């Protein structure tokens, strides 16, 4: 049954290694891909999951991201105002995202106004990318159409003083 369960999760785009799938759920007489998804969305992706991001994505010779992907945010920083004033309405908001999946870390840039991802979004939040995503100079362009935000808290061990 896991043979078809893996295909189902791949078609959904939630790519994750089979050992991680087994760890997340181990045959309670049925795979129940739905509860597999719900349990995963509150699990740290560094431990569990396979490597699928294109190699040397942080360089400048890929220019394309095809198919759907699932990624985990780590740090969110507003590169539009100094660290002294974390939010000043003197320039439009502009967000840089440090995403990861497995072994490779990638950087993304807002490039529009997206209300789903805010400065208060805690790490560990899951992002699904659908369609074609552009890579310009090792930077992933995050249009409002090709984003989906799925929550989940794993370790919000972060404090702003």
């Amino acid at each position: 049954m896991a043979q078809v369960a893996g295909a189902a999760l791949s078609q959904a785009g939630w790519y994750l290694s089979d050992e991680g799938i087994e760890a997340c759920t181990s045959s309670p007489d049925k795979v129940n891909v739905n509860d597999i998804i719900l349990i995963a969305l509150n699990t740290d992706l560094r431990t569990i999951g396979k490597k699928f991001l294109p190699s040397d994505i942080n360089s400048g010779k890929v220019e394309k991201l095809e198919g759907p992907c699932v990624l985990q945010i780590q740090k969110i920083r507003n590169v539009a105002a100094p660290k002294d004033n974390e939010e000043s309405q003197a320039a439009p908001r502009m967000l840089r995202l440090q995403m990861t999946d497995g072994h490779i870390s990638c950087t993304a840039v807002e490039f529009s106004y997206m209300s789903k991802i805010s400065l208060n979004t805690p790490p560990g939040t899951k992002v699904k990318l659908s369609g074609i995503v552009d890579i310009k100079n090792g930077f992933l362009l995050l249009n409002d159409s090709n984003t989906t935000v799925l929550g989940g808290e794993v370790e919000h061990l972060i404090e702003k003083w």
């Binding site: 590169v79 539009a80 105002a81 660290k83 003197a90 320039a91 840089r96 100079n137 930077f139």
Partner: protein, 612 residues
């Protein structure tokens, strides 16, 4: 002589004005023993019978609060003794003017008393002091009739004064007691802290002999503002901007500068990616065009705070020098009362007449005549606080009779008065948005339509620039080159006098007639120095004072404490508190705080070792 009544005013000029208005031109003037106060006599009617009116004035406060003997000489009483065991009394201020004896001799034989004092909070205290002076010597009352009277007025116009005489009232003892409590509290706290500080630090740290270290509810917060600014300057680390700009040319020798919609980027790689996305391009498309009208608001009336701000920011004048010049102009008879915090013109005012008086000076004669011909505009509405009408010209001066500072202030006052009654300024702002590849830039410009108060206040003018070319959507243009610029964030600069005044006003520290005194005090005690640009720079001794106050007990250097104490004291005025029950508690809390401060002075002592 059947019956005479007596009237007391707080200024001799105001006394003469009211006497003239109510006496219908018939006066008998005489000079008193002081030499600065005059007595006016005239006949009239008060309460159904003919009455002789006698009008006089007193110069400001009459009594000030102080200590008795054996406690006003230091080195003989412990400072902690002053808090709740030192007898207190009232003694004359300005003893050269025998105000009490003058009041007694001029009120002897009077029957009724009417008080034309100011309507603010600091006026009813003078009211009750005058009663304490005059009531002992006066004809005793008959039956159950009321003798003491008070009048309420705002302006010095005919109708206002006559109506104020028509309707009368009574004073407020509960309102006077609040001011009395404030005076007692301030004197106790200041004399307690200053003595200990200047008796400890003077004899143990070398070059502070013959020096005074002072504490109070105003000087200390004023210093706190400046040292907070100094700390903010000292703890700033620069960052790096990255702004992207490009220029588009339509006709030969007609280029156009543009601005990025996203103003700043703080990542070098991100900025480089955006540049590489734009650099190799040759078209410029047009997205949208804008055309809206707008107005620049005419200035409000003139307050003392705004006078001081403009004097210190545009005329190179200290607050005390400005106040002295304004007072001299008032005494000579050229401008109205220069200590007011009301920014709303009185309903009854000869605005047209005052404007028509200044219809001959070559600097603004054309504008004055044009306004008189085409009809004036109503003033902008604003706050009212009783007190006195705003600062307006009264006579017509020239460059010759006045000189230097007086003329420099008079020009600004007259120009502000003319501007506050003129029209507004209308300008059209055109913004055109271009698109370069994946990014969009904008450029904006202004053009004037009908100048208003700008004709009298040129420094508030709208700058002139070449009009943006008219374009329709879909047009394409060539672009010269797209380049980047690197910039650094700039640290803040030291406080200016205008900024300090506007910080003082909002927090309640000081008042309309005490800001110059406090600033000059902290300048004279070598706490701050005035540098180029009229900027107040903290010195070593002041930095140590505040950095020690924060470490020892933080509410001393804290702007909100004065407001909190004032709010607590207003209960006495409102009739919902008890005088002793409030004063004793508020003195006890401060006594405990001082007794903690004296035993926790090692922390501040270990801070001057890194200096003198």
């Amino acid at each position: 002589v059947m019956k005479t009544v007596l009237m007391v005013a707080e200024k001799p000029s105001l006394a003469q004005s009211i006497a003239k208005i109510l006496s219908r031109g018939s006066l008998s003037s005489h000079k008193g023993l002081n030499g600065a106060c005059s007595v006016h006599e005239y006949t009239g009617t008060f309460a159904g019978q003919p009455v002789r009116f006698k009008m006089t004035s007193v110069c400001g406060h009459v009594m000030t609060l102080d200590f008795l003997g054996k406690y006003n000489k230091w080195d003989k009483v412990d400072p902690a003794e002053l808090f709740s065991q030192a007898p207190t009394e009232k003694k004359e201020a300005n003893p050269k003017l025998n105000m009490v004896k003058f009041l007694q001799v001029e009120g002897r034989g009077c029957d009724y008393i009417v008080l034309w004092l100011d309507c603010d909070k600091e006026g009813e205290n003078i009211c009750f002091e005058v009663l304490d002076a005059v009531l002992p010597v006066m004809n005793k009352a008959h039956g159950g009739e009321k003798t003491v009277f008070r009048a309420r007025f705002s302006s010095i116009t005919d109708t206002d004064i006559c109506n104020a005489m028509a309707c009368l009232g009574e004073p407020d003892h509960n309102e006077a007691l609040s001011v009395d409590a404030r005076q007692e509290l301030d004197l106790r706290i200041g004399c307690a802290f200053t003595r200990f500080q200047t008796k400890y630090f003077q004899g143990k740290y070398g070059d502070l002999d013959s020096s005074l270290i002072s504490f109070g509810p105003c000087q200390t917060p004023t210093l706190g503002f400046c040292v907070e600014r100094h700390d903010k300057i000292q703890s700033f680390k620069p960052e790096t901007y990255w702004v992207l700009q490009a220029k588009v040319n339509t006709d030969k020798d007609r280029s156009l500068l543009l601005d990025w919609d996203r103003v700043r980027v703080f990542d070098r790689e991100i900025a480089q990616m955006f540049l590489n996305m734009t650099k190799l391009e040759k078209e410029a498309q047009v997205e949208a065009t804008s055309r809206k009208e707008k107005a620049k608001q005419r200035p409000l009336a003139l307050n003392t705070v705004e006078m001081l701000r403009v004097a210190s920011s545009s005329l190179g004048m200290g607050p005390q020098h400005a106040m002295q010049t304004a007072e001299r102009l008032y005494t000579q008879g050229y401008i109205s009362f220069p200590r007011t915090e009301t920014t709303h013109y009185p309903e009854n005012f000869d605005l047209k007449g005052s404007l028509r008086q200044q219809a001959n000076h070559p600097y603004w004669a054309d504008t004055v005549k044009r306004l008189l011909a085409e009809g004036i505009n109503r003033p902008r509405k604003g706050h009212d606080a009783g007190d006195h009408p705003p600062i307006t010209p009264m006579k017509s001066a020239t460059e010759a009779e006045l000189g230097g500072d007086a003329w420099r202030l008079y020009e600004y006052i007259t120009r502000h008065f003319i501007a506050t009654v003129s029209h507004d300024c209308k300008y059209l702002q055109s913004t055109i948005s271009f698109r370069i590849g994946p990014e969009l830039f904008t450029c904006s410009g202004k053009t004037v339509l009908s100048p208003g108060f700008t004709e009298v206040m040129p420094w508030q003018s709208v700058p002139l620039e070449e009009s943006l070319p008219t374009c329709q959507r879909g047009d394409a243009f060539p672009v010269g080159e797209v380049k980047m610029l690197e910039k650094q964030t700039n640290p803040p600069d030291y406080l200016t006098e205008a900024e300090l005044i506007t910080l003082m006003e909002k927090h309640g520290i000081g008042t309309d007639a005490s800001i110059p005194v406090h600033i000059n005090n902290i300048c004279q005690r070598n706490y701050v120095t005035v540098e180029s640009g009229r900027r107040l720079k903290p010195t070593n001794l002041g930095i140590v004072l505040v950095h020690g106050y924060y470490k020892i007990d933080a509410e001393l250097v804290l702007p909100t404490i004065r407001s909190a104490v004032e709010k607590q004291l207003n209960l006495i005025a409102q009739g919902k508190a008890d005088y002793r029950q409030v004063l004793g508690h508020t003195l006890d809390v401060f006594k405990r705080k001082f007794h903690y401060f004296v035993d926790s002075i090692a922390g501040m002592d270990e801070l001057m070792e890194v200096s003198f």
